[PDB]
């Protein structure tokens, strides 16, 4: 039966059918949003869901037999696996995080469709030639995070009272949002020289990002 | 008589004339802005308009006789057509949107005048070589927008209570405007881990944007 | 005496002497800032000023004889002229704008010093290959400015009540500062669809700027 | 004994060891952050430090015997030296800045480990090819900063009352943070034409930045 199924799986109809449901479940997912819709076509959409997740567990299985090991060696397939799976976990139990993560299946439309793969693949290909800098950067953030926690965490618990808060705050400063009016001016009301810690931080971080762009925009 | 008019339309004078009015009606639109001016040279400006729109329909007509099918197949002429059409719709009836959309006729100056066309043209040419990425992003937004609606729409109606509500908010976060002080810090007061949803969102959406720039910078 | 002076003007000492005063007047200009300093070395700096402006009117004259017409054909010289001049206008009369514009002389350090000229020159050289786009852009701003004035100027006098206010506000939106939390969200409290006017405006304006960078970053 | 130690220092083990401690002291610094951890494994962490600093001076010494002059001529070694020196200064005395600056020893990991060096190196290499522009800008800031101080420092002490006050503010405006709502709109309530000072400032400073990026992107 191998080749029998293998001709179904590898068939055009198959894919087109899968891509069709993606877009359907996709559209249906946006109505599941409407408080109203849920009172009318409420159940219809609920059943349509269990159906789709079924059809997808089938599809994902059939695909495995037809590919065996090569499947759990395919980035794109693994995704579909670890996404249909999350959608399988009981509607109840634990937390509803998983219940929300289900919408992650609409990402399957990147899988099932060529071109999308190209871009995604094209985008991701660059990540490697960035890790050297990213590492540097993280180290930087880590060092300043620590310094900031022990410099302003006392009188500014909210933004620097913790190693992790400082991280968050420094990332904000990196995106340059409300960094002056919201963080550094207030800070300076107690530590006149705080500007000596942030302006430099902004330069380094800014500079690095600028180069990182140059790289990707050349290398 | 064809060639007769075809020598009028196709002439230099003709174009130069149309361009003269554009820049004239243009200067007029900016005065029609002033409350004061409308109390003095008020009507002078009102009639002047009904005149231009006429002269512009005549012109648009003449051009169609001189081009027949070719006219309704030229982007630039089409624009000129639509823009004149709008301006034609009665000052009254329906909503005043149209009444405002009239000022779109000053975009006519991009049409009538070469060079502008070149730049506009040079710009639009890049668009198609982005669509693959623009689609990816849009899918992305749709997915996270749906997630956000069901993750914070209950306690934060204004920013995520609706699917479109969330789209707007997320776009804001993408432009990085007040993203931390304005939206994420406040959100975290109820959902400590919301930073797990937005920081990653910020990275992905930023990365893409950076790449996109590169593409256009190079490709 | 021509060659006599011409050898002084063209002399090394001359320039070095001029560049020396620039830096001196420059340094002295930053102390003229201090409320305190003005009570101590107050007059000293005041006289030192009249002296420098003298020495500079001399220098500027000597330079003219040695160059005649070629002088008022030299961008760099013209500057020095139209800057030493402003500094000549009476400390009183009219308004103190001119009294502040005097600090513009420290710009002479870009003049008197090679290398600086290179960069400046290098920077300015690009402006030309940007005017096509800049023109387009301005037209755009003008069109939207007008539309906005007649769309929100009524209930939002501060930000759109005038053609010029709208300009200012739109530039702000272009820099993306407080555009959402400060302008569009408030706006939407009265005009639910305002987002249909600004998001597009942001895209066009953003896109254009992105290209303009590509150009300068290639052309 | 020279070669003896020269084989210790120059050895693999040696380096790997130093690197092991870096990452160790590093992890320690982040715990020394926690108020809780300091109440439990408190001293364990305190002694651990005084140990590393020792081992690091020994190491820094050994390296100097093995390199003599070459040591105080290598950027990376110099850094390592200075960073250890700081860490050496008594926990007490003077201000606790030093006490915090100690965490700068985690930058040691950029030194000890190759690759990091490469990136850091690759980054710093670009710096010199910017100085001409960096100087221009700095001159610019100085000039406008002086102007702003005497144009708004009286009615706006917090942002322009001082020469350095104005520097900070202007830098803020350059990063474009809250520049309109935060500073210029408020300023305009007293000085209607202040937009004439800032918009141009924004353009010039932006242009430069854009070019600079280009330079580094290409040159």
| Domain extent at residue A36 | 1-114
- DSSP letter, residue A33: T
Burial class (CB in 10 A: 0-12, 13-18, 19+), C50: exposed
SS3 at position A130 = helix
Measured in degrees and rounded to the nearest 5, phi and psi for residue C11 equal -65, 155
**Residues of chain B neighbouring A213 (CB-CB closer than 8 A):** 210, 213-214
Say how many CB pairs under 8 Å bridge A and D.
71
**Gap between the Cα atoms of B61 and B88, Å rounded:** 13
C72 shares its domain with C174: no
How close C86 comes to chain D (CA, Å)? 15
Per the structure block, which two tokens stand in for D107?
Answer: 């930058």
Is D173 within 8 Å of D201 (Cβ atoms)?
yes
**DSSP assignment of chain D, as one string?**
-HHHHHHHHTSHHHHHHHHHHHHHHHHHHHHTT-TTGGGSSHHHHHHHHHHHHHHHHHHHHHHHHTTGGGGGG-HHHHHHHHHHHHHHS-SSSS-THHHHHGGGGGGHHHHHSTTHHHHHHHHHHHGGGTHHHHHHHHHHHHHHHHHHHHHHTTT-HHHHSSHHHHHHHHHHHHTTTTIIIIIIHHHHTT-GGGHHHHHHHHHHHHHHHHHHHHHHHH-
C83 shares its domain with C103: yes
Q: Detail the DSSP E strand segments found in chain B.
A: none
Per the structure block, which two tokens stand in for A194?
Answer: 């705080």
| Intra-chain end-to-end CA distance of chain A, in Å | 49
Is B160 within 8 Å of B186 (Cβ atoms)?
no
**Gap between the Cα atoms of A29 and D148, Å rounded:** 55
Per the structure block, which two tokens stand in for D11?
Answer: 């050895």
Per-residue CA distances from A49 to A45, A116, B143, D153 (Å): 6, 24, 16, 65
D62 touches chain C (CB under 8 A): no
Per the structure block, which two tokens stand in for D5?
Answer: 């130690």
How many distinct structural domains can be found in chain C? Answer: 2
**Gap between the Cα atoms of B54 and C169, Å rounded:** 34
**Residues of chain B neighbouring C130 (CB-CB closer than 8 A):** none
D171 touches chain A (CB under 8 A): yes
A25 shares its domain with A80: yes
C53 touches chain B (CB under 8 A): no
Say if the Cβ atoms of A132 and D118 lie within 8 Å. yes
**Gap between the Cα atoms of D166 and D176, Å rounded:** 15
Is B159 within 8 Å of B138 (Cβ atoms)?
no
Per the structure block, which two tokens stand in for B176?
Answer: 């990085």
User: At CB < 8 A and 24+ separation, what contacts does B148-151 make?
Assistant: B148/B197, B149/A33, B150/A33, B150/A100, B151/A100, B151/B191, B151/B194, B151/B197
B134 shares its domain with B204: yes
Which of C129, C131, C141, C143 is the best mutation test for B, with the most CBs of B within 10 A?
C143
Say if the Cβ atoms of C176 and B175 lie within 8 Å. yes
Tokens 């007047």: give the residue. C25
B191 shares its domain with B120: yes
D59 shares its domain with D157: no
Point out the domain boundary residue: A114, A140, A161.
A114
Per-residue CA distances from B118 to A64, B15, B219, D150, D151 (Å): 54, 17, 19, 46, 43
Nearest CA in chain A to D181: A181
B64 shares its domain with B162: no
Residues 177-196 in C contacting B (C-alpha not used; CB under 8 Å): 177-182, 195
How close B99 comes to chain A (CA, Å)? 34
Q: This structure's resolution (angstroms)? A: 2.8
CB atoms near residue D22 (< 10 Å)? 21
* Nearest neighbour of A103 by CB, restricted to B147, B208, B217: B147
Q: Detail the DSSP E strand segments found in chain A.
A: none
B200 shares its domain with B130: yes
A138 touches chain B (CB under 8 A): no
CB atoms near residue C48 (< 10 Å)? 16
Say if the Cβ atoms of B116 and C133 lie within 8 Å. no
Per the structure block, which two tokens stand in for C132?
Answer: 């096509």
Residue C33, H or E segment: none
D27 shares its domain with D57: yes
Within 8 A by CB and 6+ apart from D57, the residues are: D84, D88
Point out the domain boundary residue: C77, C97, C114.
C114
Q: What is the CATH number of the domain that holds C159?
A: 1.10.287.70
How close C182 comes to chain B (CA, Å)? 9
Measured in degrees and rounded to the nearest 5, phi and psi for residue C198 equal -85, -40
Is residue B73 left, alpha or beta, with left meaning phi > 0 and alpha meaning psi from -120 to 50? alpha
Give the torsion sign (CA, A40, A46, A47, A53).
positive
- DSSP letter, residue A41: S
C141 shares its domain with C204: yes
C85 shares its domain with C140: no
- DSSP letter, residue C178: T
**Gap between the Cα atoms of D114 and A95, Å rounded:** 44
**Gap between the Cα atoms of A153 and A162, Å rounded:** 7
Report H helices in chain C. 2-9, 12-31, 37-40, 42-67, 75-84, 97-101, 108-111, 116-126, 131-152, 157-160, 163-174, 185-188, 195-216
C138 shares its domain with C108: no
Is D113 within 8 Å of D26 (Cβ atoms)?
no
Per the structure block, which two tokens stand in for B158?
Answer: 């204004």
Point out the domain boundary residue: A81, A114, A147.
A114
Q: What is the CATH number of the domain that holds B19?
A: 1.20.120.350
């Amino acid at each position: 039966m191998y080749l029998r199924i293998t001709n179904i799986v590898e068939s055009s109809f198959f894919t087109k059918f899968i891509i069709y449901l993606i877009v359907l479940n996709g559209i249906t997912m946006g109505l599941e949003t409407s408080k109203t819709f849920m009172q009318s076509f409420g159940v219809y959409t609920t059943l349509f869901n269990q159906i789709v997740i079924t059809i997808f567990t089938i599809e994902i299985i059939l695909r495995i037999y037809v590919h065996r090991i090569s499947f759990f060696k395919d980035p794109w397939s693994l995704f579909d696996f670890f996404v249909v799976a999350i959608s399988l976990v009981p509607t109840s139990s634990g937390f509803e995080i998983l219940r929300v993560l289900r919408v992650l299946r609409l990402f399957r439309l990147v899988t099932a469709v060529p071109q999308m793969r190209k871009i995604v693949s094209a985008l991701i290909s660059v990540i490697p030639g960035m890790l050297s800098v990213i590492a540097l950067m993280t180290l930087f953030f880590y060092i300043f995070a620590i310094m900031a926690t022990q410099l302003f965490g006392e009188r500014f618990p909210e933004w620097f009272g913790t190693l992790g808060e400082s991280f968050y705050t420094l990332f904000q400063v990196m995106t340059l949002e409300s960094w002056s009016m919201g963080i550094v001016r207030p800070l300076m009301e107690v530590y006149p020289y705080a500007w000596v810690f942030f302006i430099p931080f902004i330069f380094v971080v800014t500079f690095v990002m600028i180069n990182l762009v140059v790289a990707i925009c050349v290398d």
